[PDB]
Amino acid sequence: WVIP
Amino acid sequence: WVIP
Amino acid sequence: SCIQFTRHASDVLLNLNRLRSRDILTDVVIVVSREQFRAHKTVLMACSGLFYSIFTDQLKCNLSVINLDPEINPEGFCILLDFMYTSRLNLREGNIMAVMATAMYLQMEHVVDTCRKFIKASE
Amino acid sequence: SCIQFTRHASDVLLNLNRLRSRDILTDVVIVVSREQFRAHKTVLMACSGLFYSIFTDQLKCNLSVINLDPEINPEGFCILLDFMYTSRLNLREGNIMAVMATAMYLQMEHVVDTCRKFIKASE
Ligand SMILES: N#Cc1cnn2c(Nc3ccc4c(c3)CC(=O)N4)cc(Cl)nc12
Ligand SMILES: N#Cc1cnn2c(Nc3ccc4c(c3)CC(=O)N4)cc(Cl)nc12
Ligand SMILES: [Cl-]
Ligand SMILES: [Cl-]
């Protein structure tokens, strides 16, 4: 999971 | 395009 | 010896979400209490262990309407359906419990994982 | 304020290709001379300007069989259909002209681009  |  | 186009899978998913927004080739309505959500069975199966089981069933595969358990929260379902079609999860303090419960029911393991990690960090 | 799962779009595409291999929820047969290819209309539209035009048409959207131009090469179509479902393009010296001609007909601009670049490098 990432900060887009 | 890339070499996978 | 294949070559691979890095952005292809994301471009496909973007166009599947455009089809959903325009209600093109949607073949099922998911009923969550008083709310209805139109979707493509193939995308639902590709994202969820529950829908994969439902739509591989020789009788349920032909249903145009699927009713979810009355304990399922419509907003939590809406957030997860948006995630299915975009890879983006609108996870907030106010919705995390509903999102995690819905992801457990839908059998969306990666969403469950992260909800668990975000909850553990706040305790 | 969304979070994003990096591998989600690729995981969706992998499961759409699994559905295609098992012939689950395929809703169209593409006829290319003597050969037939089963696919999902939603994936075809998401990958190709030609199929996007065909399946948004108020009459053609309901067809179970689509016949392509007799000049289209079945192997070239097979390679492009595999690309649609995997992001991987089996581009070879022996098939590049057929792949490029098929990609131009199918209106798959990124494939056309690369075929053009690979041909320019060999001349
Ligand atoms: N054919 C086919 C096909 C279509 N969909 N699909 C799967 N869909 C799925 C099944 C379980 C889970 C998820 C997705 C996300 C998750 O957390 N669990 C799996 C397979 Cl092995 N195959 C297929
Ligand atoms: N709704 C919808 C929807 C479904 N599919 N789709 C598009 N599919 C497409 C159209 C043109 C081209 C390609 C894909 C690859 C290419 O080279 N050209 C576009 C839009 Cl703007 N929208 C949609
Ligand atoms: Cl997931
Ligand atoms: Cl393309």
Please report the domains of chain D, with CATH numbers, ordered by start residue.
1-123 (3.30.710.10)
* Method by which the model was determined: X-ray
Q: Give phi and psi for D4, each to the nearest 5.
A: -135, 135
Q: How far is CA C96 from the centre of its chain?
A: 15
Taking every pair of C-alpha atoms in chain A, what is the biggest distance, in angstroms? 9
Nearest Cα residue in chain C from A1: C114
Helix (H) or strand (E) holding D33: none
**CA atoms lying within 13 Å on the CB side of residue D56:** 13
- Closest to C112 in 3D by CA, of C93, C123, C96: C96
- Closest to D48 in 3D by CA, of C20, C8, B1: C8
Hunting for tokens 């089996």 — which residue is that?
Answer: D90
Q: Give phi and psi for C2, each to the nearest 5.
A: -65, 155
Q: How far apart are CA D107 and CA D111, in angstroms?
A: 9
What tokens appear for D106 in the block? 């199918």
CA terminus-to-terminus distance, chain C: 50
Q: For residue D9, which residues of chain A lie inside 8 Å, CB to CB? A: none
DSSP state at residue D41: H
> Which residues 6+ apart lie within 8 Å of D103 measured at CB?
D80, D111, D112, D115
What tokens appear for D5 in the block? 């799962």
Give the ligand 1 atom nearest the CA of C112. 17
Q: Quick one: resolution in A?
A: 1.9
Closest ligand, as measured to the CA of D9: 3
**Cβ D76 vs Cβ D101: under 8 Å:** yes
Helix (H) or strand (E) holding D31: strand D28-32
Q: How far apart are CA D82 and CA C40, in angstroms?
A: 21
- Closest to C90 in 3D by CA, of C117, C66, C68, C114: C114
Q: Answer left, alpha or beta for residue C107, where phi above 0 means left and psi between -120 and 50 means alpha.
A: left
Hunting for tokens 């995981």 — which residue is that?
Answer: D11
* Cβ <8 Å between A4 and C114: no
